[PDB]
Design a protein around this ligand. Structure first.
Ligand SMILES: [Mg+2]
Ligand SMILES: [Mg+2]
Ligand SMILES: [Mg+2]
Ligand SMILES: [Mg+2]
Ligand SMILES: [Mg+2]
Ligand SMILES: [Mg+2]
Ligand SMILES: [Mg+2]
Ligand SMILES: [Mg+2]
Ligand SMILES: [Mg+2]
Ligand SMILES: [Mg+2]
Ligand SMILES: [Mg+2]
Ligand SMILES: [Mg+2]
Ligand SMILES: [Mg+2]
Ligand SMILES: [Mg+2]
Ligand SMILES: [Mg+2]
Ligand SMILES: [Mg+2]
Ligand SMILES: [Mg+2]
Ligand SMILES: [Mg+2]
Ligand SMILES: [Mg+2]
Ligand SMILES: [Mg+2]
Ligand SMILES: [Mg+2]
Ligand SMILES: [Mg+2]
Ligand SMILES: [Mg+2]
Ligand SMILES: [Mg+2]
Ligand SMILES: [Mg+2]
Ligand SMILES: [Mg+2]
Ligand SMILES: [Mg+2]
Ligand SMILES: [Mg+2]
Ligand SMILES: [Mg+2]
Ligand SMILES: [Mg+2]
Ligand SMILES: [Mg+2]
Ligand SMILES: [Mg+2]
Ligand SMILES: [Mg+2]
Ligand SMILES: [Mg+2]
Ligand SMILES: [Mg+2]
Ligand SMILES: [Mg+2]
Ligand SMILES: [Mg+2]
Ligand SMILES: [Mg+2]
Ligand SMILES: [Mg+2]
Ligand SMILES: [Zn+2]
Lengths: 122, 50, 60, 89
RNA sequence: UGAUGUUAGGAGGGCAAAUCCGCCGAAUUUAAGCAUAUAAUUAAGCGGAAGAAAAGAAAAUAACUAUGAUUCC
RNA sequence: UAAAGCUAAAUAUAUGUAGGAGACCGAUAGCAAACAAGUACCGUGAGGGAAAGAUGAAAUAGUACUCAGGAAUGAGCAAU
RNA sequence: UUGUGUUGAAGCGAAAUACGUGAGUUUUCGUGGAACAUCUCCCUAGUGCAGAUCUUGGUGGAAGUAGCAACUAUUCAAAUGAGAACUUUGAAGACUGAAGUGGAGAAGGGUUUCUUGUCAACUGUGAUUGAACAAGAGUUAGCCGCUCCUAAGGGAUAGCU
RNA sequence: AGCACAGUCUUAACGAUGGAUGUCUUGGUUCCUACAGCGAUGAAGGCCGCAGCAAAAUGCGAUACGCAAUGAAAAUUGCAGUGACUGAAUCAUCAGAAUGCUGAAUGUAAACUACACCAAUUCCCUGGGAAUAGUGGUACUCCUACAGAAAA
């Protein structure tokens, strides 16, 4: 690392650890940034992205569009938004994969689990 | 021949079972590359060596 | 779909009875699969797991 | 003559010297001596020599299932008392 | 005193060897040839242990104004 | 002060397991093996033993439609 | 130390009113799609190929050439099919000649057996055939055998080395 | 509508065949540090099985690509299916339960799923009931104790 010699800074090792991470670690890696308004109401800076949140697309060809998150794909490292779509060569409709770090989430969907986390973070 | 022992007959059946192709639905899977079974054996070409 | 914590209060008698009827049901499903009735082929897994849970509780 | 020392006498080659070996599964059991040429089956030991490094590594400890040994790792760091469980709830 | 006992309670046997302990035991090679010599108290073979093993509290040096169990640099 | 016995530390570690690193190699190189590799295959047997990595940011974009042809396949005013 | 690059790197193909005695250096156009130098002075090495009956891989002339010759022998008409000298049906002419390409077993093989489908490669000419490829089936014993007895022999126990 | 002899060799431009070059790397290699055996309470190795549709490799053992418990915690997905709306879908940890036939292999054997002797054996309720040809033991050498017999 920087000063403690007990963990690595090898490209090989922790580039192998990113692509074979277990499914319980993949949700911490898949985290987004909180808006300015949500950063006063909550003392956290960033949260892992969940399903029924609302996000603003900030980077890419679809920058500036908003909408709701309809699916999370932990194997491919991607999320899906409700009206951002594509046509295949057949003519069937699909969803364009978005990377969660390209996004900032503007409205949350709280529950029993979330509260006991935001409370600790504040 | 026609005369056999139990163990040998069971091994013959086992060897016959493993000489079948990769299923078709398995190929529609993602995160897979296995096209065909690379250990196929024809009775007249390669001997079992039992 | 049975749960382990709901079986810790049963007596050995009806624990064995429950295992017996689980086995009868799984045999029925196997028979119906041998005939080309594919409709209920997906229920086998749940019955198998239920049998395993009942055996676990009884043996402990 | 006609069953000479080459092609003609290869047609007389039915019969078997060796068959499958109980305790190692290789076709190396001399049916008439009754002794495996690979593992030395009828005897208690294993029949491995030091002049073959390659042979000594096809059938060593690491190259199988390790059924009971693999479950015995990390007890050196957990060191739980036998008969114990984590606290409930 | 020995045999006997499906009497009660227990032990040994097989795997693995990089480092360790005991036995057995060559020739290639060098000598510009070769037989003593060297290779070597080595390779192959057969046995026995531990996280280290083996050694170890003088029937030891010295010849000095004397030192003081073993191991290793 | 022989012909009986025990005993830590400072030493070693081409094995097994875990961790860290380099003026080292870069798919005919580096372990035989970067891939269902001691695998496929050869020998009665003791044994011998390979070849084979790369579309694209995204196939949650892997080629829809039309014409010719028995089909493969080709062509387009048509398509990612 | 001080520089190039999505306003296009390395590499590769063809070149130049270019420089040098020379090994080479530099530049244009095309392709390409992601990295590349340092000549300011130093350090370092698995550092320079025409050959070794050199190693591994790819490719020629010979060349549409050598050749596709044992086992007496084929013909007419029909069905199928995109397509029949070598698939099927009927009619002819012939062979094996009971020491038979007729029946039944052992060693060895292991599903080659049966029904259906069927042609990318194979079936050294064709092929709609097939022991090839795919889906599903098929082996029933008190009386047939093993299993029991002993043989030439093998392994062991006591003891001894 | 018409005109270039054919073959062989040389140069350019566009292609075919082949896989060199450059760039890439979840691999190798060496050194440094730390810990260290397993087995009759049945090891290492071998064989046979287990999924709804399932060949290999990977994982498991008649509870068989996984049970219970503990920490996280909504989905897993090729179809079919199962999931709170947190002992449940999935990931991690792993202490309880369970762990086929073998193998030193140890009742006699072994290119046999061959053949013995001894105790019938297991389960449910609190003395009654029920089930099953199913279960366990029996190598060799040795030590301590014991048992009687036999010899002196
Ligand atoms: Mg036979
Ligand atoms: Mg043959
Ligand atoms: Mg000879
Ligand atoms: Mg013989
Ligand atoms: Mg013994
Ligand atoms: Mg021993
Ligand atoms: Mg000499
Ligand atoms: Mg000389
Ligand atoms: Mg000489
Ligand atoms: Mg030695
Ligand atoms: Mg030991
Ligand atoms: Mg000691
Ligand atoms: Mg001592
Ligand atoms: Mg002493
Ligand atoms: Mg490294
Ligand atoms: Mg290589
Ligand atoms: Mg350069
Ligand atoms: Mg060189
Ligand atoms: Mg060269
Ligand atoms: Mg050359
Ligand atoms: Mg040639
Ligand atoms: Mg000719
Ligand atoms: Mg023919
Ligand atoms: Mg005649
Ligand atoms: Mg005649
Ligand atoms: Mg005659
Ligand atoms: Mg047939
Ligand atoms: Mg047919
Ligand atoms: Mg042909
Ligand atoms: Mg076939
Ligand atoms: Mg029968
Ligand atoms: Mg009979
Ligand atoms: Mg005899
Ligand atoms: Mg001309
Ligand atoms: Mg609870
Ligand atoms: Mg839980
Ligand atoms: Mg067991
Ligand atoms: Mg036995
Ligand atoms: Mg017999
Ligand atoms: Zn063997």
């Amino acid at each position: 690392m920087k000063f403690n010699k007990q963990k690595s800074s090898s490209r090989r090792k922790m580039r192998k650890a990113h692509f074979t991470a277990p499914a319980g670690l993949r949700r911490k890696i898949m985290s987004s940034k909180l808006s300015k308004e949500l950063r006063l109401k909550y003392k956290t800076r960033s949260l892992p992205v969940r399903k029924d949140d609302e996000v603003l697309i900030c980077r890419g060809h679809n920058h500036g569009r908003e909408g709701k998150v309809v699916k999370i794909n932990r194997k491919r490292y991607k999320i899906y938004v409700e009206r951002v779509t594509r046509e295949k060569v057949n003519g069937e409709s699909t969803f364009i994969g978005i990377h969660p770090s390209n996004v900032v989430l503007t409205k949350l969907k709280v529950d029993k689990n979330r509260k006991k986390i935001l409370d600790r973070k504040a | 021949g026609s005369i056999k022992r139990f163990r040998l007959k069971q091994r013959l059946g086992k060897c016959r079972r493993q000489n079948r192709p990769v299923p078709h639905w398995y190929r529609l899977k993602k995160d897979t590359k296995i096209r065909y079974n690379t250990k196929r054996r024809h009775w007249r070409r390669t001997k079992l060596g039992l | 779909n049975v749960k382990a914590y709901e079986l810790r209060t049963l007596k050995k008698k009806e624990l064995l009875d429950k295992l017996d009827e689980l086995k009868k049901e799984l045999s029925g499903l196997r028979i119906s699969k041998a005939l080309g009735n594919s409709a209920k082929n997906s229920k086998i897994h749940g019955v198998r797991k239920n049998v395993a849970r009942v055996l676990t509780v009884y043996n402990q | 003559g006609k069953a000479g020392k080459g092609t003609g006498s290869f047609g007389k080659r039915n019969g078997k010297t060796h068959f499958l070996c109980l305790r190692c599964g290789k076709r190396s059991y001399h049916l008439q001596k009754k002794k495996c040429a690979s593992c030395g089956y009828p005897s208690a030991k294993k029949r491995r020599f030091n002049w073959s490094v390659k042979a000594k590594r096809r059938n060593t400890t690491g190259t199988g299932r390790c059924r009971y040994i693999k479950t015995l790792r990390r007890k050196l760091k957990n060191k739980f008392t036998e008969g114990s469980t984590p606290k409930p709830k």
